[PDB]
Design a protein around this nucleic acid. Structure first.
Lengths: 108, 100, 81, 96, 93, 107, 82, 100
DNA sequence: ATCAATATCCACCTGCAGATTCTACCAAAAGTGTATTTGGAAACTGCTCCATCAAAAGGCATGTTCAGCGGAATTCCGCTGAACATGCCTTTTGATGGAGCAGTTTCCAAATACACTTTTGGTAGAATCTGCAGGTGGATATTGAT
DNA sequence: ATCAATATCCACCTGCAGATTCTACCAAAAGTGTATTTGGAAACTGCTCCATCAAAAGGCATGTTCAGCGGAATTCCGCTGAACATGCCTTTTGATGGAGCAGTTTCCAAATACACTTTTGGTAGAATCTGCAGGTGGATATTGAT
């Protein structure tokens, strides 16, 4: 059928039609250009890829194949930028990074 | 027999290692649920709670406290101690703006 | 023989402290912590209940809690929104 | 008649397989990713909204989404987000 | 033509302190203050409405916004004046 | 023809506030009671801060409220202080406050 | 060619700020630290301000640009138009 | 017998009362402006500035620094000192979340 | 240094809670084609205000000297938190009515949308006016040496 | 405690810039008055999933002992505060050219607005499938005592 989704056109996995729909209805402005949702979906997809890429490694590192919350937390807090971007975000069931103030370590 | 005893701090260190590894909630659920409901009762009566709503609140509170314990430790260490105290939590909250 | 905030026990407060990297704890910390936890919950719950009453419900929903957390600048991932 | 509940789950997953073909993800992890996407969406959209208002515009274009991104994301993350976004808008525009 | 709340800030000023004036810098801060709280309340109402699948902001969301945003006593009094003003505006055309 | 402000018994502009709400794109629609309520609240708050800034002016033997007076009034009031917890009033200074341990002597 | 202006933040000015800040005694290393802290504060506010300028396709940084940038950073400023 | 000298700390307290009592900016105006133009210039060339934009940055900057010193002072006093040091400033910024 | 007591690892095992693939029913999207509308850039330009060069001058930065006392290092000891084994009461897990959370239907007060008519908050400009900064003197502390 | 060197306090005073005072223009508001559209309150209802009760489960309260940490006391060195001489650079009052922001008209490429057609992501219920958390065993590192 000759009806190709805007996502396929922009060559993205994320749903352009939806991001567009969500912008209009979020009362962000009177009008919304046609490229805004494309651009925006492209940016949402990329960040999603960045985190899954790192959370995935964190999983391999624990000899695990399924990403769990812990993995997303290890991924985000070990990455300076993602860490800043999510500086005020709490990932449920993520724990903290193993870290012990040196002065508290036993006197070897 | 050979009354084995670990020196002060060794098991504590062992515990930090363990808990920084895991992610389970550390407060018991029922007691926490009771506290939440009791505090809510002051804002509106005969309220019900989705299971998920209490879990969200507990996840949020523990993450908040664990982080406050982090800055607190930093305040103790700043004062050349390894023992956290109230003055430490109080200083941390004041600088966080939850204080002067 | 039962006060709720005291239900948040010393052993539990100690485990939390541990996750935060704490090695030695002063006795006065346990009571100090409860007090802080209580102020935390009142601030969050109050806002959640306000979102509950606005929606005319009698049940606090995870979303009412998530929205309250976001307002306090304590955004939480995992429970919707 | 049980009303829908949209989520980015299928797209998150699609993206997962391109990056880690043999990796899975648990429900709780998916919910977090979903929260992650809605959060950035709101932050970016929100900023673009203000940008327009400041400049007395009624329209949010890719221009606003771009500046929004530069103001929102940290350096390198913003660099790639800008290029990825420009890439998609280009490829889109150049197609019947 | 740039609008400002100055004449209104000034009117209210004369009601509470009949013999006090205000420097322009102070009025500038007062104008920032009004716009600030205004945006804060409306933003709050905006989200409140969306969270509830509502396309309309009424006196009711403005009220919750006020309860969500303002500290204890100030909320209590703003809500009263708010309710009061609406009821009065209602009783007349 | 009465202004909507007079019908509500207010000094603040109901028509203007109702207008700013629409332009600010906060929702598809805006009820008529919304701007009435919001202007009441805005007006009430400026009355509280001016009530307090005016006293501070009086306290400093001045007749014209200046930024420092607004700052004194805000920082000295717990609630306004919180509402403006992350706000900076230009030319406002800070409240005089010297930590005890910094003072000399010993009593 | 502006070069080392961070030094215009004189030792006496940093000391006065510490005074309003209620500070009685200052270590010798405080001055360079403070300058470092101010440069970063300024870089961040100016970066966002200048970004609002360019988005508006202007060549002049306005007070609103600075006010909007400050608000982004949670440092809302009253007195200059916002 | 002849010279008169205030003891260390008396003029400092005199100064705190003096500065806490006023509101004028404490950094020299022009030098501050050059700093702004330098930082700005190294971000984007050929930029002009409304004078009030420079003044708004100075007002924000001084309020930020004054509030930071308060926090620092509390960190020093926490360590049983009256002299603020770099590490006090670092602790305060770490807890404020500027490097936490 | 030398065991002895424990904690920690690692390789392997397996049962099941939660992830997956399956299929269909479908309202809500999302794409598409046509008609209508309009935001906002391009273009010309009036005009505010930014950059800048000028000059006079004293407020304030710089740099030095000197020594008061704050920081920090060391010693030391009373005490309070850590570890631990003892004993059990509270939490947790899994099963069951019912309250509300929602999904539907309905309809009415209320919110666009549009056309006029009318009141007014800006403001450009002039002229008048007033609070107060800031200079002065001298009366009331505050400090610090003795 | 008495006393001299200084800073603070403060009511009186007057040039000035910043504020209050018209006068007029007035077009963009804000209001009045039909016509048309509709959101969401309200009543009714079905199915979750939440509060509750019971029993099997495992973490916490408690008292003892003493290691070691925190803080009091003492000490000394050197760094940071005060005071002072010297002189420059900020600040201040002014004018000037022109950059560039902003007002105004012009008009098209892009957007909104239905209407129609097709795709699809979410839901429900059923069956199938699997990553891995604990459970065991045995090796070995860690820690604390002699």
């Amino acid at each position: 059928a000759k009806a190709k989704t805007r996502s396929s056109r922009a060559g993205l996995q994320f749903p352009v039609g939806r991001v567009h729909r969500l912008l209009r209805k979020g009362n962000y402005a009177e009008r919304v250009g046609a490229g805004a949702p494309v651009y925006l979906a492209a940016v949402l997809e990329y960040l999603t890829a960045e985190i899954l890429e790192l959370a995935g490694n964190a999983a391999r590192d624990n000899k695990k194949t399924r990403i769990i919350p812990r993995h997303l937390q290890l991924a985000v807090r070990n990455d300076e930028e993602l860490n800043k971007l999510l500086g005020r975000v709490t990932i449920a069931q993520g724990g903290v990074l193993p870290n012990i103030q040196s002065v508290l370590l036993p006197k070897k | 027999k050979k009354p084995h005893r670990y020196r002060p701090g060794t098991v504590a260190l062992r515990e930090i290692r363990r808990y920084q590894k895991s992610t389970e909630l550390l407060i018991r659920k029922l007691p926490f649920q009771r506290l939440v409901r009791e505090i809510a009762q002051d804002f509106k009566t005969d309220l019900r709670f989705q299971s998920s709503a209490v879990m969200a609140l507990q996840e949020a509170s523990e993450a908040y406290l664990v982080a406050l314990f982090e800055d607190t430790n930093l305040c103790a260490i700043h004062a050349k101690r390894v023992t956290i105290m109230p003055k430490d939590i109080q200083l941390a909250r004041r600088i966080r703006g939850e204080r002067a | 023989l039962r006060d709720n905030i005291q239900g948040i026990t010393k052993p539990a407060i100690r485990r939390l402290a541990r996750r935060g990297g704490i090695k030695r704890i002063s006795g006065l910390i346990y009571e100090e912590t409860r007090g802080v936890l209580k102020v935390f919950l009142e601030n969050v719950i109050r806002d959640a209940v306000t979102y509950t009453e606005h929606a005319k419900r009698k049940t606090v929903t995870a979303m009412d809690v998530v929205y309250a957390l976001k307002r306090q600048g304590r955004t939480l991932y995992g429970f919707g929104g | 008649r049980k009303s829908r509940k949209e989520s980015y789950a299928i797209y998150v997953y699609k993206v997962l397989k391109q990056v880690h073909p043999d990796t899975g993800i648990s429900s709780k992890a998916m919910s977090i990713m979903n929260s992650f996407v809605n959060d950035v969406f709101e932050r970016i959209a929100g900023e673009a909204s203000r940008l327009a208002h400041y400049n007395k515009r009624s329209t949010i274009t890719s221009r606003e989404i771009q500046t929004a991104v530069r103001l929102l994301l940290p350096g390198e993350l913003a660099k790639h987000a800008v290029s990825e976004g420009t890439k998609a808008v280009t490829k889109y525009t150049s197609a019947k």
